Design a protein around this ligand. Structure first.
Ligand SMILES: COC(=O)CCCNC(=O)c1cc(S(N)(=O)=O)c(Cl)cc1SC1CCCCC1
Ligand SMILES: COC(=O)CCCNC(=O)c1cc(S(N)(=O)=O)c(Cl)cc1SC1CCCCC1
Ligand SMILES: [Zn+2]
Ligand SMILES: [Zn+2]
Lengths: 251, 251
């Protein structure tokens, strides 16, 4: 499978033709205020420098594999373990976030992919209700170098080639996310890549993460993907809600 | 295991001492309204008179085995199949519902136990989030004989003995439930019997169902449990919410 051509994703995975797919366009005025949505809780996300983590150009994204003991709760009794994070981005003067807001596409988007603690392995969780939870934040331009992101972005040159990887010191993984864990949208969707399995709980933060113009340029670019092609515009088109209601932790 | 058969359930089954157990006290004023909770969809519940259904005294309840094809949705793409329904009840003028509302215990409670269509087997669903969903309705005293409930109560004589069972004509299972499928409380908890597994989605109807005093007396007076004891007060004590917010489908 790849972005921007064949095979059709449903030939790869029938679930890529499901009714309830991600990403979606968030229209905050059609969002449902639910005060049952409490602030997210992250434990164990502040890692020591050793052991190191693996950072990989997989030809679809840059992926950081997370070690055991990163605990995330969507609320009381809704418990997850973090597996990995990866990024979606565009190209020189083209935004490449997956999710959109009132049709606006942000420069880039981070995904932190988690597994329900009721499941030992991802493949057991795929297609199961609440089996996987993703935390999603938009990356936008700010005036400062983002030092947390600099630790990954400063290493993309080393992994320019499709299928290459490097080791990086442990860092504060939660510094890659917005500081505001209270304001977010939540809906039920799918993986945005094959096999596009449904039953995924998507949390999208109100607050965006700020990178320098240079940092956003580094992210788009530096990596190469399938063939002699640049790894850019690695986002799936917006998918219809098809009767789903996005909830919001705020009115 | 037994109801008030001290020693306590946590020895038989230490999941019974989990943080997120059922049942709970519903306090409507503290419930979170989410306009995302849509009306329950129950299709295939209008059963023909043939085939017959197994009705059984298991010494903990009377249980009706439900056939394939009873489809239920809690939301878009969130589907279930009904497996069985069973009742919880009191004694000679002592109420026996499992959920309470602001401390009010109701005379009885019907539970309709469903299996998520993302799970082949109940034993894969036990302990997983949303694996099982129960529809729960309160049984109150009203002036009239309940038609739907007569079909089950009229047959308890035949199975008064722990372990006994009979075939009963098909019936409209949906007729056992309240009027308004748009008005319910919802939270996540556990089986209210051993093994007390967590991840059960509980839906409790706002509106009740009315049975005659003769009918309520029949329910609690006709059946025998373990030992030479009456099958009565077959309900678990109220469990703490521990931070879980109960949701409501209505402002
Ligand atoms: C060698 O090339 C690849 O591995 C491509 C896989 C890219 N997909 C993911 O890493 C991924 C993305 C999401 S997303 N964008 O919806 O947040 C999620 Cl939720 C999970 C995974 S990993 C999954 C994909 C294959 C089946 C099990 C592991
Ligand atoms: C057959 O008698 C027994 O010994 C086991 C106790 C019966 N319990 C249930 O039937 C039961 C009750 C609920 S409840 N009160 O929370 O709604 C639920 Cl959700 C499921 C079951 S059946 C389940 C229990 C053990 C594993 C197989 C199926
Ligand atoms: Zn992603
Ligand atoms: Zn029950």
């Amino acid at each position: 499978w790849r972005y921007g051509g064949d095979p059709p994703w449903p030939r790869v995975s029938p679930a890529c033709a499901g009714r309830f797919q991600s990403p979606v366009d968030i229209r905050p005025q059609l969002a449902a205020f639910s005060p049952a949505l409490r602030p997210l809780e992250l434990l164990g996300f502040q890692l020591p420098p050793l052991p190191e983590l693996r950072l990989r150009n997989n030809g679809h994204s840059v992926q950081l594999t997370l070690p055991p003991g990163l605990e995330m709760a969507l609320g009381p009794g809704r418990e997850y373990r973090a597996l990995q994070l990866h990024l979606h981005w565009g190209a020189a003067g083209r935004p490449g976030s997956e999710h959109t807001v009132e049709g606006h596409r942000f420069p880039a988007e981070i995904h932190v992919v988690h597994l329900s603690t009721a499941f030992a392995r991802v493949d057991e969780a795929l297609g199961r209700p609440g089996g996987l939870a993703v935390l999603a934040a938009f990356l936008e331009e700010g005036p400062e170098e983002n030092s947390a992101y600099e630790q990954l972005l400063s290493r993309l040159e080393e992994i320019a080639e499709e299928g290459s990887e490097t080791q990086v010191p442990g860092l504060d993984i939660s510094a890659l996310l917005p500081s505001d864990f209270s304001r977010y949208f939540q809906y039920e969707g799918s993986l945005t890549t094959p096999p596009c399995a449904q039953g995924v709980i998507w949390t999208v933060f109100n607050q965006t993460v700020m990178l320098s113009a240079k940092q956003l340029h580094t992210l788009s670019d530096t990596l190469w993907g399938p063939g002699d092609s640049r790894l850019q515009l690695n986002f799936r088109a917006t998918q219809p809600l098809n009767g789903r209601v996005i909830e919001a932790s705020f009115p």
